[PDB]
Amino acid sequence: ETKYELNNTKKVANAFGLNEEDTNLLINAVDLDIKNNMQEISSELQQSEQSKQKQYGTTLQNLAKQNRIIK
Amino acid sequence: ETKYELNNTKKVANAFGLNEEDTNLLINAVDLDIKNNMQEISSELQQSEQSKQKQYGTTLQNLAKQNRIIK
Hints:
Number of strands of chain A: 0
Keywords: scaffold, bacteriophage, sapi, structural protein
CATH architecture of the domain at 1-38 in chain A: Helix non-globular
Largest sheet of chain A: none
CATH class of the domain at 1-38 in chain A: Special
Distance between the termini of chain A: 61 Å
Number of helices of chain A: 2
Oligomer: homodimer
Structural class of chain A: mainly alpha
Assembly: dimeric
Protein name (chains A, B): Capsid morphogenesis B protein
CATH topology of the domain at 1-38 in chain A: GTP Cyclohydrolase I, Chain A, domain 1
Pfam families (chains A, B): SAPIS-gp6 (PF16722)
Largest interface: A-B, 32 and 35 residues
PDB class: structural protein
Strand content of chain A: under 5%
């Protein structure tokens, strides 16, 4: 659903009072921290399944150059 | 505060400004949430080994993020 189903967690961080992005950022650090340890955690499984986890995007305006010398 | 090396995490939650118990409580919810899912999700990564664990393996999916235990 949302990072091992961290729906309830989102409300926990949001309780502190921020907005919405701050809360998600917190879970991103914790969820990522634990995930890095999973490599050691006893787990193998055998299902073999893939899935796209969306992507990110970057903004970049153009903002041309001015042109005013004489007229 | 040593479940999965969440040292930096504690500082992230504490940043909001609370005291100390509130921060730990947050990690308890997140860490507990991921742990519950750990039973399913797994991984075949490492790139470190220990001393006696080489050879063998597979060229199939290692992540496999699905939920079947739930019904």
